[model samples]
Target chain A: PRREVLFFPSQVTCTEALLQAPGCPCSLPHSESSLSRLLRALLAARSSLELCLFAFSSPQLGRAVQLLHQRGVRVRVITDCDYMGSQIGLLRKAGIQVRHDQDLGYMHHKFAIVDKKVLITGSLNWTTQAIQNNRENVLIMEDTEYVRLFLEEFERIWEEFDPT
Target chain B: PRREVLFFPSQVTCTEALLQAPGCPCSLPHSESSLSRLLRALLAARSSLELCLFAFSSPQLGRAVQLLHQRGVRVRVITDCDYMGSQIGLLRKAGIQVRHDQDLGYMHHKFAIVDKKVLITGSLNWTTQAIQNNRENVLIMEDTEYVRLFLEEFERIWEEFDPT
Candidate 1:
């Protein structure tokens, strides 16, 4: 099991910001942008991708998700009811399974379990504003217990929100 | 080392919500609320508590910080510049050290390092709205590596944000 961390709203590239952090791992590429690294990681999904996000408005990331779906990856997304963004529609149009929490409170999770092995989460929402405007953090964990816990939580919420 | 998790926005006690969630550990108390448990955890701090928060509006959590200060625990809070909440002043009035990030972007972190050992973080900010109205998740880790990384992050941001 391994872990990774990144901080945001830097005046430089995402990967540069991560490398500038105190505890950045040396295994990660030094040349790639941080978001690009994440997108690459997501695009590496082999079987299933479980996303529980408050917002999903980044076009690049949306395109990646659609690509994953087209490649036969079982991509499922649970998003906030208020966040019916263009990207979400694009995801729906691509035939990916998407659901919204049918309630007053937001589905305010910002996490993805890729292939049910790696867990990416923290305060960083997958939105342009969150990436470029907010001082946020993202944590990636490959720890088994951590990934399993998030997977269980995602599935629980996914069932709590029905398709009808 | 131990780890715990909680999810939110249930129409019941926070602790009840925790217990009801799948994979709920039986080690935690069954009679307490989740926020109360967090408050008690913060209040149990003996030496230091480093708070990196985006918002600080909950009066009860604020009072706990003041109480920690009065009891000789060294408490330092780093909050967003735009969050000049009443509780922030109360903490300052109590002689606790507080600093705001002097940047256009928000200091949108919501984690606490208690006594330099336990690390608390996730999508849930320590706000009334987050606890009462939003679907959020929290993770607490007593793992050495996780705690050390967050401790380093807190110190880095604290230095980056001088007493301005």
Candidate 2:
């Protein structure tokens, strides 16, 4: 089982953390910077990617998840009602499945599960604000017991996420 | 290795998350609430506890760390410049050695290593807002390799924390 941790607003310049695509500044999920590594991990999903988040606004991360879907990784996202029209619209438009919580309380979890085996979670909100400005963390693990519980939580929420 | 994960604004009321000791409400690091379990984890430190966090504002967590010090665990804290005279002051007053980052960027890491073996890191700040209202997560593990790397980062910052 693999376990690792990352802290954000890392020791890197914007130029170092991003790779410009001619006219636009973007990262291809392929840098050694904290943000890049995190995106890369998300992009590494092969069979499936399950995301439960309070918000999802990072253009970089959005692009990565889109790429994962394009790669046929079977991406599913559960987000909050507040962010559906703004943060997650792109994801929803990309043909990715997304669900939102309708309760007064938040669907405020920020974690991802890959292939139902690896769990990537922590204080991160999948936002550029959090990635570049806030001090944040992401913990990645492949421990079965830990992964199972988190997945159970995700599954419970996913089922309860009935917008009907 | 013992591992666990918790998500906050849990399926409990504030009354459920806290215990009343007369006028003031407090949790004594012993409950099934997410907050209590986390505090119990911190209080479990017997040898040493190293913390690097952006904020330490939760009264419950504050009391837990203080109790850990009272229990004779070697406790050290690294925090941000914005919160010294406020949140971490109680920790310093408890005789726990505390340091802050002098750099331009925020010392935004939120994690702790206990006994140089167990690590607790995640999105939940040691703040009351996070505990009872916000959605957050905590990852706990006793992996040696992961513990060592986090300890190295903590030690590096601790050494570089020269107030000179």
Candidate 3:
């Protein structure tokens, strides 16, 4: 039953709530804890990166995805059409395959499958507020069954949401 | 390494986005998929149930926690004071130790640690929208180290945010 799971922001405290508010008592240090790990997972991908998110406004994450694309990682993305304004455009500009769920409801999943092995997900969205301010959670696991299940979900959306 | 991880709504499809909108194509089935699993985790607690969430409007989950309290499971809760209006009061009335961060920020963690062994965290809040109308994700893992980190997070908040 041994497993390797990863979490971010080594320190979790009431201070997280302080950051959740509109202003911070002190200068909020940029939190690259979660984002950095996510980047690492993407960077380590050897085959593909499949992502589905409600929002995609984090430039750092966008840059990381672009880097993966540049490195020959097959990248595909699906996002809520409403929030796919500039952020999705940036990914598209980088030559990443991006699509929007045109359904009346939102494509509100915040998850990614790296090389069909690592599953990255949680309450954390790919946005500044989620990484730097909000009290959110991100998890990365390589459990085979879990990874397979997520890939199934990813493909279901990719088929309907393909930008072609 | 082999590991066990659980996902909610065993199925995923475009129909989920359709349900995310104001109205559903048909009468949406009551999906207790995520919530019911959460209830099972709470009911299985042998000693303690620690929770931090942004909202708690789901009566079913509320009742489940109350049941656990009645059965002598030590229950503790931390929530944003702003959302502690009525639902939180219900838990307090049931003799659960409920606290709210007095700081002007949101305690926006939607997670629970059951007996320091099971970790239940995800984007799905304990709310009607999350369960019935919104597309959300939840994970329950029994990884020892992951559970320990979440417990550490719980303790940090419990010390500073204890309702005195």
Candidate 4:
């Protein structure tokens, strides 16, 4: 029996049909090589990036975000205000839009909707220790439906995302 | 002379032949399937287990310990006293002999000695989140000499690892 499930091979090329699935399984398994590939893909983005995270401490990821900003990608980051000092520091230095909403009952969501078409979210935290040492998983989904729902979540938090 | 170091794949099943050699090449590469296999093997053990960890907030590992206890395996755990709240709750539920050492000076070792012969150590942590989501590595070495060294490290912290 054949069923449809998104498969994440190398981050460079993805099956467009799989991305459109309601329940997309796009998290490419973590590895030293795989992470290097993921960073390159994220750095090459040209349009927009929306990230929702509890913790973002990966230096590798921070560098990629900086490069993306240099390339003129509109970057918007939403994180738990109480715990986002370092993350905001990384994005602010690159001139990317940063938002924190600590008042909304511990923004514990760990996901990112990138380019409004690719969604990267899962059980993994975007930290150097997590990627290189810890047991973590990150899903990169290119489904429009998946991104549509995540974008709504991003919008919902947009009102409270900015600092007063 | 046999004193010369040679790197060759040996079919010998002895612990010393497999894991005690210098630069032991246990290619337990970092991946979900590799980590999963290690955790599952630990969960199935029936003899004894001694774990030394820094941070352990995983509920799945806690539950696995409980299952091992039910099967009559003696489980002993030593964690950095700094990670208290998370360690105590699960250890109590699993009935594991939990110990901590505030005097151990930032106890940051992460590894496990299994059945007094197999040394299961690497960059892996004792957390359910690690098993399911984190990108971690687990190296299972079957060498009693190596395991003894690990045991000695644990003994040095035994006083500090008081279960209180």
Using DockQ as the measure, which candidate wins? Answer: 1
Order of the predicted models by DockQ, top scorer first:
1, 2, 3, 4
Is 2 or 3 the stronger prediction by TM-score? 2
Tens-place lDDT per residue, model 1, B1-164, is 65877777633333434222334444544466667667767876899999998878876678778778877999989988534548888788778888886545468888999999998887887778778778787788787877888888889888887756
Span of 10 residues, lowest total lDDT, candidate 2 chain A: A15-24
Superposed model 1: Cα runs more than 4 Å off: A10-30, A82-85, A102-105, B10-30, B82-85, B102-105
Q: After aligning candidate 4 to the native by TM-score, how far in Å is the CA of A146 from where it should be?
A: 1.5
Worst 10 residues of 4 chain B by lDDT: B1-10
TM-score of chain B of each: 0.82, 0.83, 0.77, 0.67
TM-score of 3: 0.77
Q: What RMSD does each model have against the real structure? A: 7.6, 4.9, 8.5, 18.2
TM-score per model over all chains: 0.83, 0.79, 0.77, 0.42
List runs of model 2 lying over 4 Å from the truth.
Answer: A10-31, A84-87, A101-107, A133-135, B10-31, B84-87, B101-105
Give the candidate number with the greatest TM-score. Answer: 1
What tens digits encode model 4's per-residue C-alpha lDDT throughout A20-80?
2234245643333546655655764679888777668765677677767777888888765
Model 1 lDDT tens row, A84-138: 5489888887788889965455788899998989888888878777776777777
Q: Point out the higher-scoring one by DockQ: 3 or 4.
A: 3
lDDT of 3 by residue, A22-67 (tens): 3335465545455555666667788899998877887667777777
Please tell me the interface RMSD, in Å, for model 4. Answer: 15.4
C-alpha-based local distance difference test score of model 1: 0.77
Best prediction by lDDT: 1
